[PDB]
């Protein structure tokens, strides 16, 4: 009955975990400007996320089917970021001032860096049609979003068209989002909302986007390059520079015993957990 741990987070067989610091999984994947540390991440053994990470959704809103994505994250060990729609290519929509003070970078209005907040151009917002064929060997995690304005005037100012939609189709996904104008209390100075969506695009499939307003377009998606045993661990601890074969949220374990006492949610070759004293 081992009762002792080293009170810090180590590598798991010389493979360093991804420690998110004050960023959440949502902030990392969407590209919260406070999360540049994680723009391109090396292979991980497990992932560590604090209870209430401070930098999550900078612009207030929602990440749709978020817990299922997280669950889908704990059997992935390595993403490789790739550009699927270059910000450069938006010829008929303003693509450079979709920013907000709710998403500061160095005290300047910025925005999640993996998606683009398109806005009208010359008092017009033509219908957008874009495709990406996944010509890679690997599955892709694609993310996009919708902006829910706070009134008819705002809608018409940003997007011209009073009534708008976003349709997204793959070989399995048949989605058609409609923005929800409501009156909301300000979170981070904003009463508008952003709602985000994701899908896994299988090799050789294609994703087709079409919209006439409120579209938060992708720029970067994620190649799932290494699948394998992984986890998301909720911990407050910082990185400990050590190494181990058994990790817990409380700290690592170097032991020979058959049982342990620390924390039920462990990862690696570990003694079995009991409540005993």
């Amino acid at each position: 009955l081992e009762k002792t741990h080293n009170g810090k987070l180590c590598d798991l067989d010389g493979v360093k975990p991804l420690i998110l610091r004050d960023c959440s999984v949502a902030g990392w994947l969407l590209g919260n400007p406070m999360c540049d540390e994680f723009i391109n991440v090396p292979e991980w053994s497990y992932i560590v996320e604090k209870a209430s990470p401070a930098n999550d959704l900078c612009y207030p809103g929602d990440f749709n089917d978020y817990e299922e994505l997280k669950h889908l994250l704990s059997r992935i060990n390595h993403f490789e970021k790739i550009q699927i729609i270059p910000k450069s290519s938006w010829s008929n929509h303003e693509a450079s001032s979709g920013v907000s003070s709710a998403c500061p970078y160095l005290g300047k209005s910025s925005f999640f860096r993996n998606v683009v907040w398109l806005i009208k151009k010359n008092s017009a917002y033509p219908t957008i049609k874009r495709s990406y064929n996944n010509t890679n060997q690997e599955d892709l995690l694609v993310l996009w979003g919708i902006h829910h304005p706070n009134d008819a005037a705002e809608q018409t100012k940003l997007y011209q068209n009073p009534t708008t939609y976003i349709s997204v189709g793959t070989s399995t996904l048949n989605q058609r989002l409609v923005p929800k104008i409501a009156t909301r209390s300000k979170v981070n100075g904003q009463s508008g909302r952003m709602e985000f969506f994701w899908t896994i695009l299988k090799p050789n499939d294609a994703i087709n986007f079409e919209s006439n307003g409120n579209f938060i377009a992708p720029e970067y998606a994620y190649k799932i390059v290494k699948k394998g045993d992984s986890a998301i661990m909720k911990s407050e601890l910082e990185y400990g520079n050590c190494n181990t074969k058994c990790q817990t949220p409380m700290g690592a374990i170097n032991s020979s015993m058959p049982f342990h006492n620390i924390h039920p949610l462990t990862i690696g070759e570990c003694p079995k957990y009991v409540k005993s004293n």
Binding site: E67, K70, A231, I232, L265, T266, K272, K275
Partner: protein, 43 residues
């Protein structure tokens, strides 16, 4: 005893509170069982 219950972390949102509770009482449920099973193997 190599094949004993191992708990996994699972996450549920603000409107998934019933299945969060179901999950918690199951993971606890099995922990409480194997705790009892190891304490009474010894004794």
């Amino acid at each position: 005893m190599n094949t004993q219950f191992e708990a996994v972390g699972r996450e549920f949102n603000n409107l998934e509170r019933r299945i969060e509770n179901l999950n918690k009482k199951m993971e606890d449920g099995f922990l409480d069982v194997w705790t009892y099973n190891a304490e009474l193997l010894v004794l």
